[model samples]
Target: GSSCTPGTTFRNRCNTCRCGSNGRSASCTLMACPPGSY
Candidate 1:
């Protein structure tokens, strides 16, 4: 836990991804055309 650096961010398919300040957990924008569509 808390491995990722705070404010770390990137793109994920049709959405954006980021690492939370809390425990450095990961989260995404959850766009409609996601990578899971394929």
Candidate 2:
């Protein structure tokens, strides 16, 4: 299963990211952007 926690930091972007489920496994391409720009 895909489970994540808060304040999770990731890369491949310039935003606050978290753990993501990629059908087969987990990845770090999810972002919880702020109320601004990227």
Candidate 3:
């Protein structure tokens, strides 16, 4: 993954992800994402 501005963050298929304010780390919802599976 790459760095993203906090407000410019793009959500995944889970639709609950964000970019951290500092180093642009991934801030996402609970659990893991496995391809098309849910």
Candidate 4:
């Protein structure tokens, strides 16, 4: 599981992005989670 969400960045949050030889990219961002996401 991710310790963060998507869109914002900060310390203590996961900032490690490891890409393999799949010719694809994967990443994650910790967002503040705006309203109306329920």
Candidate 5:
């Protein structure tokens, strides 16, 4: 189970990311932007 508080920073991204069973952590590897955009 992955979880994080608000304002958590991402090492491979420019936005603060959070992971969980619901939020945006369900598929961290499947989540991705169009390279220069979100």
Candidate 6:
């Protein structure tokens, strides 16, 4: 089990994302859209 460390960075969907919090756990924004389209 991991804890939420505010102001930390994590990878999501091949993009670098920042960590946020709700005073309990960590949250992050969605990753950037891929360059290619189907």
Best by TM-score: 1
Instruction: Please give, for residues 1-38, the per-residue lDDT of candidate 5 as tens digits.
Output: 34554444454453444445444452234446568754
Task: Name model 4 segments beyond 4 Å from true.
Answer: 1-14, 27-38
Higher-TM-score candidate of 1 and 4: 1
Off by over 4 Å in 6: 1-3, 21-38
Ranked candidates (TM-score, high to low): 1, 3, 6, 4, 5, 2
In candidate 2, what are the lDDT values of residues 8-32, reduced to their tens digit?
5455444444554434333454566
Query: In candidate 6, what are the lDDT values of residues 1-38, reduced to their tens digit?
Result: 45545777766566565556633454565555576521
Task: TM-score each candidate.
Answer: 0.45, 0.20, 0.43, 0.21, 0.21, 0.36
Native-referenced Cα lDDT, model 1: 0.68
Q: Which tens-of-lDDT digit does each residue in 1-38 have in candidate 3?
A: 46777755666775576777774686777657678744
Model 4 weakest lDDT span, ten residues long: 5-14
Error of 1 at 23 (Å): 8.1
Could you tally the backbone clashes for each prediction?
A: 0, 0, 0, 1, 1, 0
Candidate no. 4 TM-score: 0.21
Q: What is the C-alpha lDDT of each candidate?
A: 0.68, 0.48, 0.68, 0.40, 0.45, 0.57
Worst 10 residues of 2 by lDDT: 18-27
1 or 3, which is superior by TM-score?
1
Residue pairs clashing, model 1: none
Q: Predictions ranked by lDDT, top down?
A: 1, 3, 6, 2, 5, 4
Q: Write the per-residue lDDT of candidate 4 for residues 9-36, one digit (tens) a residue.
A: 3342334443433425435345554555
What's the lDDT for residue 27 in model 5?
A: 26
| Positional deviation of residue 17's Cα in model 1 after best superposition, in angstroms | 1.1
For model 1, residues 1-38, the per-residue Cα lDDT tens digits are 43566678866567777778863577888668845653
